[PDB]
Design a protein around this motif. Structure first.
Motif, PDB file in Angstrom:
ATOM      1  N   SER A   1       0.776  -1.151  -0.001  1.00 34.64           N
ATOM      2  CA  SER A   1       0.052  -0.085  -0.040  1.00 34.64           C
ATOM      3  C   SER A   1       0.671   1.375   0.090  1.00 34.64           C
ATOM      4  CB  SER A   1      -0.856  -0.094   1.335  1.00 34.64           C
ATOM      5  OG  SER A   1      -0.216   0.360   2.573  1.00 34.64           O
ATOM      6  N   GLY A   2       2.081   1.287  -0.354  1.00 28.38           N
ATOM      7  CA  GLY A   2       2.989   2.276  -0.315  1.00 28.38           C
ATOM      8  C   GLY A   2       3.551   2.783   0.915  1.00 28.38           C
TER       9      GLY A   2
ATOM     10  N   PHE B   1      11.126   7.778  -0.116  1.00 29.12           N
ATOM     11  CA  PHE B   1      10.081   8.625  -0.207  1.00 29.12           C
ATOM     12  C   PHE B   1      10.533   9.974  -0.941  1.00 29.12           C
ATOM     13  CE2 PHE B   1       7.523   6.267   2.735  1.00 29.12           C
ATOM     14  CZ  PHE B   1       6.374   6.180   2.138  1.00 29.12           C
TER      15      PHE B   1
ATOM     16  N   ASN C   1       4.943   9.831  -9.068  1.00 30.99           N
ATOM     17  CA  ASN C   1       5.545   8.611  -9.121  1.00 30.99           C
ATOM     18  C   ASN C   1       4.099   7.785  -8.724  1.00 30.99           C
ATOM     19  OD1 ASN C   1       7.376   6.774 -10.180  1.00 30.99           O
ATOM     20  ND2 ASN C   1       8.957   7.322  -8.716  1.00 30.99           N
TER      21      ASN C   1
ATOM     22  N   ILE D   1       3.411   3.508  -7.266  1.00 28.50           N
ATOM     23  CA  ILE D   1       3.903   2.421  -6.633  1.00 28.50           C
ATOM     24  C   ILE D   1       5.002   1.336  -7.343  1.00 28.50           C
ATOM     25  CG2 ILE D   1       3.405   0.552  -5.182  1.00 28.50           C
ATOM     26  CD1 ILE D   1       1.011   2.086  -3.831  1.00 28.50           C
TER      27      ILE D   1
ATOM     28  N   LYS E   1       5.147  16.925   2.575  1.00 26.09           N
ATOM     29  CA  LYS E   1       4.477  15.463   2.396  1.00 26.09           C
ATOM     30  C   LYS E   1       5.322  14.398   2.586  1.00 26.09           C
ATOM     31  CE  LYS E   1       2.832  11.995   0.065  1.00 26.09           C
ATOM     32  NZ  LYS E   1       4.022  10.947   0.471  1.00 26.09           N
TER      33      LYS E   1
ATOM     34  N   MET F   1       6.009   7.089   9.541  1.00 27.23           N
ATOM     35  CA  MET F   1       6.404   5.506   9.111  1.00 27.23           C
ATOM     36  C   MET F   1       7.675   5.097   9.782  1.00 27.23           C
ATOM     37  SD  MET F   1       5.002   5.570   5.267  1.00 27.23           S
ATOM     38  CE  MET F   1       3.556   6.370   4.907  1.00 27.23           C
TER      39      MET F   1
ATOM     40  N   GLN G   1      -5.322   7.487   8.673  1.00 31.92           N
ATOM     41  CA  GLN G   1      -5.325   7.928   7.394  1.00 31.92           C
ATOM     42  C   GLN G   1      -5.006   6.698   6.629  1.00 31.92           C
ATOM     43  OE1 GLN G   1      -2.740   9.056   4.830  1.00 31.92           O
ATOM     44  NE2 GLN G   1      -1.481   7.780   6.253  1.00 31.92           N
ATOM     45  N   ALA G   2      -4.045   6.000   7.011  1.00 37.26           N
ATOM     46  CA  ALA G   2      -3.306   4.711   6.241  1.00 37.26           C
ATOM     47  C   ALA G   2      -4.511   3.822   5.959  1.00 37.26           C
ATOM     48  CB  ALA G   2      -2.419   4.255   6.806  1.00 37.26           C
TER      49      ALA G   2
ATOM     50  N   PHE H   1      -6.616   5.431   3.099  1.00 41.25           N
ATOM     51  CA  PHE H   1      -5.491   5.393   1.760  1.00 41.25           C
ATOM     52  C   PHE H   1      -5.358   4.095   1.281  1.00 41.25           C
ATOM     53  CE2 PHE H   1      -2.199   7.808  -0.284  1.00 41.25           C
ATOM     54  CZ  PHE H   1      -1.229   6.862  -1.056  1.00 41.25           C
TER      55      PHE H   1
HETATM   56  C1  LIG Z   1       0.479   6.612  -6.198  1.00 45.00           C
HETATM   57  C2  LIG Z   1       1.233   6.516  -4.893  1.00 45.00           C
HETATM   58  C3  LIG Z   1       0.702   5.817  -3.664  1.00 45.00           C
HETATM   59  C4  LIG Z   1       1.516   5.858  -2.788  1.00 45.00           C
HETATM   60  C5  LIG Z   1       2.825   6.716  -2.737  1.00 45.00           C
HETATM   61  C6  LIG Z   1       3.514   6.912  -1.443  1.00 45.00           C
HETATM   62  N1  LIG Z   1       2.863   6.550  -0.363  1.00 45.00           N
HETATM   63  C7  LIG Z   1       2.101   7.306   0.609  1.00 45.00           C
HETATM   64  O1  LIG Z   1       1.918   8.279   0.254  1.00 45.00           O
HETATM   65  C8  LIG Z   1       1.375   6.756   1.746  1.00 45.00           C
HETATM   66  C9  LIG Z   1       1.041   5.490   1.884  1.00 45.00           C
HETATM   67  C10 LIG Z   1       0.504   4.885   2.905  1.00 45.00           C
HETATM   68  C11 LIG Z   1       0.235   5.955   4.001  1.00 45.00           C
HETATM   69  F1  LIG Z   1      -0.463   5.359   5.001  1.00 45.00           F
HETATM   70  N2  LIG Z   1       0.436   7.306   3.838  1.00 45.00           N
HETATM   71  C12 LIG Z   1       0.942   7.674   2.822  1.00 45.00           C
HETATM   72  C13 LIG Z   1       3.177   7.390  -3.882  1.00 45.00           C
HETATM   73  C14 LIG Z   1       2.251   7.371  -4.795  1.00 45.00           C
END
Ligand SMILES: Cc1ccc(CNC(=O)c2ccc(F)nc2)cc1
Ligand code: NI
Length: 312
Positions: free
Chosen positions: A32-33, A135, A141, A143, A240, A248, A302-303, A306
């Motif tokens: 999930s990034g 990050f 970008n 994932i 961001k 994280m 939030q996660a 997301f």
């Molecule tokens: C399309 C895309 C998706 C994810 C990312 C990087 N991950 C986050 O921003 C992220 C993931 C989980 C979370 F709980 N908070 C933030 C970059 C692009």
């Protein structure tokens, strides 16, 4: 030659941690990034690098099964007690997610509805150096592309740990390796684009202006606001990215990273509009909104949303 394990192939080499699928779903967490280092190399079996070791992870309804590969030169064995604690801390399993889910649900009907389907989404506690540079690669970008850039970065700069099937696993590089004269040129050759400059320059900045990686550990014990502002002094790290890292890797559960997806969630699903379109100031205001609403684990809440917004 060495192959990835399944729970069938090698059942003597797995240990288990009692862990309900309401406390953790691997499939909603590992892709999930948050981390970009986990791959489902065979169905329901996730492999990835944690520190200097490879792991494969799989779960039942109530058990988390794991297995460690510590290198070609070592007697293959079950995870040790210490290695199992490392993993427990990675998934922050001390913290009850069922208790947080009910606290969030009690103030937010929308969260109640979405959460019902998306249980077991929690935050990994990551290495700051990996999270930072992963990050910096995350701007503009997706994932899959971030995953590619991080894998190639670790292959080119980081130590080889082991090969399983056709996959070579490398450790995340130390700062000195990323800070060198040809680092940006090499990283551009690996497809990082402009992000190659930020990687190299941030590696350099932490080493020459902040004292090396002990600085990131200091941010982990500093308060949220001080960690965030100190992160924003680094090339390619803005509000961001700093909030992702804070949430994280630097033990700030209240950090709420605001970008396109959360702005869209907030507008579409909560009806939120700035009281004073996106801007630095409106993004800050929206993070504050979610802290006020959800409490001191707002970033974890939030996660959950997301990860769900990622599954359409
Ligand atoms: C399309 C895309 C998706 C994810 C990312 C990087 N991950 C986050 O921003 C992220 C993931 C989980 C979370 F709980 N908070 C933030 C970059 C692009
Ligand atoms: Ni509107």
């Amino acid at each position: 030659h060495m192959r990835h394990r399944t729970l069938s192939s090698s059942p003597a080499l797995w240990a288990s941690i009692p862990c309900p699928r309401s406390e953790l779903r691997l499939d909603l967490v590992l892709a999930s990034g948050q981390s970009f280092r986990w791959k489902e190399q065979s169905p329901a079996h996730w492999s990835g690098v944690l520190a200097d070791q490879v792991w494969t992870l799989t779960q039942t309804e109530d058990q988390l099964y794991c297995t460690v590969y510590r290198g070609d030169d070592s007697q293959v064995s079950r995870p040790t007690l210490e290695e199992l604690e490392t993993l427990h801390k990675y998934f922050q399993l001390d913290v009850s997610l069922a208790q947080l889910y009910s606290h969030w649900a009690s103030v937010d009907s929308h969260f109640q509805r979405v959460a019902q389907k998306f249980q077991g989404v929690r935050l990994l506690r990551q290495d700051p150096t990996e999270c930072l540079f992963s990050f910096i690669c995350s701007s503009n970008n997706n994932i899959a592309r971030i995953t590619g850039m991080v894998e190639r970065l670790c292959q080119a700069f980081g130590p080889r740990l082991i090969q399983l099937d056709d996959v070579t696993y490398h450790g995340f590089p130390n700062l000195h390796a990323l800070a060198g004269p040809e680092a940006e040129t090499h990283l551009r050759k690996l497809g990082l684009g402009y992000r190659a400059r930020y990687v190299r320059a941030s590696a350099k900045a932490i080493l020459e202006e902040q004292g090396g990686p002990a600085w990131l550990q200091q941010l982990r014990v500093a308060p949220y606001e001080e960690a965030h502002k100190a992160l924003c002094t680094l090339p390619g790290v803005g509000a961001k990215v700093a909030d992702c890292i804070c949430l994280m890797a630097l033990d700030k559960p209240q950090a709420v990273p605001v970008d396109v997806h959360v702005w869209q969630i907030a507008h579409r699903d909560y009806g939120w509009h700035p009281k004073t379109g996106p801007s630095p100031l409106a993004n800050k205001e929206l993070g504050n909104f979610f802290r006020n609403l959800w409490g001191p684990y707002a970033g974890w809440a939030q996660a959950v949303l997301f990860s769900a917004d990622l599954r359409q």
